[PDB]
């Protein structure tokens with residue numbers, strides 16, 4: 677019922693660790709990960725356990741911080757833009773599937789505000 681999760685390693689994808697990617701893991705990801713509202717975003721949406729039979733009919737580019745964390749740890753990304761895009765996709769999916777005022781949308785907005793503050797200080 678769930679799709680395979682996004683890959684976190686790919687032996688054919690060139691790997692890199694720039695100073696910006698280092699900041700993305702050690703400052704940006706870590707700051708969001710320890711936030712009180714991180715828990716919905718620390719693993720893929722489990723549409724089986726959450727009883728969301730239409731989630732992966734609507735969301736075709738799933739992303740979550742657990743995936744992002746592993747990608748960063750594995751040096752999966754070539755540049756910071758790829759990682760920033762993954763964060764943006766995660767938030768966007770939440771806004772697509774849910775509705776204004778839903779608790780989960782308010783949590784995403786709080787996390788996104790923090791993300792934006794930290795990205796503004798990228799090396």
Ligand SMILES: CCN1c2ccccc2C(=O)N(C)c2cnc(Nc3ccc(C(=O)N4CCC(N5CCN(C)CC5)CC4)cc3OC)nc21
Nearest residue numbers: 715716717718719720721722726728769770771773774780
């Ligand atoms: C969260 C809402 N939601 C969605 C729901 C419907 C549709 C889309 C989404 C969605 O867009 N996203 C990103 C989500 C991604 N992932 C999850 N995962 C999880 C959801 C619930 C639990 C859970 O039952 N508990 C137990 C209760 C606990 N409460 C703490 C707050 N306290 C006041 C009261 C107790 C929180 C954890 C655990 C989860 O995973 C660890 N839910 C998501």
